[PDB]
């Protein structure tokens, strides 16, 4: 509470530095936006199987996107990248990370142990050891402190939408984590309570509803078209009571903007 402002300022500085190249998929000659969606969704399943933190998921995705911003990868090696990144995310974030042998287990025995360990090495070289990246999740938890009063359903819904934003690089790769967290928080707040992006956060972040609008429009369409989306692991996950079953709530029809 003596450092909330310093920390928030610092994370806004770093999110720009840690941002991946927006249009890297077009420069990727073999992989596509669809294949990345399948990988990200698969990592959600891995996260749920080994009971990992949401923060670890967001961290892994950040690593993959940065690694794929300067390195080309064939479709058969995409999962190996995703594995090594998840292994690194877990080592950085988790108290008890799954041991390497278990990560070899969930890759349906496609890759060997040595391959996973050599890809861990490579990612670290490409990311040049810079792993402490800001996430949507890290801004969300700071926003929740501004609830008047605090509401569990709101929190779980905002984390559901933010998690959904990880799936589709188009159009979410062009929005910064703090902005997506703004859109996720407002959208959750309006669905559950009916209230809007609060003034205290406008003062804190410098983000107005108008500035969030471009991202809020995209996110609103993802929330409505969610049960039709090809990847479903995030909806399934958020049916649980652990997340208050927010993925079962009805999305709003219009945002009134």
């Amino acid at each position: 509470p003596d450092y909330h402002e310093d920390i928030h300022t610092y994370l806004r500085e770093m999110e720009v530095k840690c941002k991946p190249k927006v249009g890297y998929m077009k420069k990727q000659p073999d992989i596509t936006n669809s294949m990345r969606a399948i990988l990200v969704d698969w990592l959600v399943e891995v996260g749920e199987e080994y009971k990992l933190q949401n923060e670890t998921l967001h961290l892994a995705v950040n690593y993959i996107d940065r690694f794929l911003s300067s390195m080309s990868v064939l479709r058969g090696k995409l999962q190996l990248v995703g594995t090594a990144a998840m292994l690194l995310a877990s080592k950085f974030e988790e108290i008890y990370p799954p041991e390497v042998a278990e990560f070899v287990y969930i890759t349906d025995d496609t890759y060997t142990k040595k391959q996973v360990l050599r890809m861990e090495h490579l990612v670290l070289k490409v990311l040049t050891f810079d792993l402490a990246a800001p996430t949507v999740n890290q801004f969300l938890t700071q926003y929740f402190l501004h609830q008047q009063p605090a509401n569990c359903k709101v929190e779980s819904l905002a984390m559901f939408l933010g998690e959904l934003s990880l799936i589709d690089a188009d159009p979410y790769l062009k929005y910064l984590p703090s902005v997506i967290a703004g859109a996720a928080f407002h959208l959750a707040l309006y669905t559950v309570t009916g209230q809007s992006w609060p003034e205290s956060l406008i003062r804190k972040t410098g983000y107005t509803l108008e500035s969030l609008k471009p991202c809020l429009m995209d996110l609103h369409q993802t929330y409505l078209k969610a049960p039709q989306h090809a990847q479903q692991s995030i909806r399934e996950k958020y049916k649980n009571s652990k997340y208050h079953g927010v993925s079962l709530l009805n999305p709003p029809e219009t945002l009134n903007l």
Partner: protein, 297 residues
Amino acid sequence: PGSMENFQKVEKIGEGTYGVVYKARNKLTGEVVALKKIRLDEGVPSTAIREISLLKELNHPNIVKLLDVIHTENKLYLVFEFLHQDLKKFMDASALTGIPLPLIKSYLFQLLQGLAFCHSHRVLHRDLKPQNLLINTEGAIKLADFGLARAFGVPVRTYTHEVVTLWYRAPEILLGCKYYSTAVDIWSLGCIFAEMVTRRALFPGDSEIDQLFRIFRTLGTPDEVVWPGVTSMPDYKPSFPKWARQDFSKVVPPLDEDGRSLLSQMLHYDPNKRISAKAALAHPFFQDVTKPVPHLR
């Protein structure tokens, strides 16, 4: 990035949180360096993953300077600027009369700067003890060894419960609270501050209960008035012996009125009320702070 060809090993200094630390010399620039070797032969340990990534972000005059990372096959090196000695080894070589209060005042002031910086950048050190603090010959002191360090979020989640070497471990960790934060590092500095003044550890316990009981004998046994919610904490016991808090003039006799005030705020039971590194820099104790030099060992 660098080549191990350029470096020449001088001597082995000692083990740390992980890996062995060496003294070495750059052959081309002439610069004396510290090398931290880790044998990879389970992949890169999370300790090295944490230390490297966090230390690359932390550029402060009072945090150890990471210069380079050498990522050769089967072996990983960390290149640091070489200062002179760690505080543990310095307090061993220092005679009884050897550490002047102006030097202590200076060291604490600098350490609080390094800590304020860390906490401003969402980093918990979580192993502040004499061996992990390094001095040079010009009056500087720097925090080092971020192997047990981690990045925290706001608000904090539950993190590892192992944390901190026993003598310097805060009450909230010992009593096993769900959440600990920035205030654990302040506690450790509190103990270090007292250690430097008295030339002996403040609470040298051998077990958890021994550590708790030593803290209570000095600060009084905590209750709901001094620390609300303490009776609800997981490892609190109603059978805990009731000791009275004693005078800080008797806990740390050579310390003036301002010094006692700061230490009590650094060793406050309630981590909420415990002084922040940031707020400590403005304490009247440092009104006359300078930068004295230590002896050469």
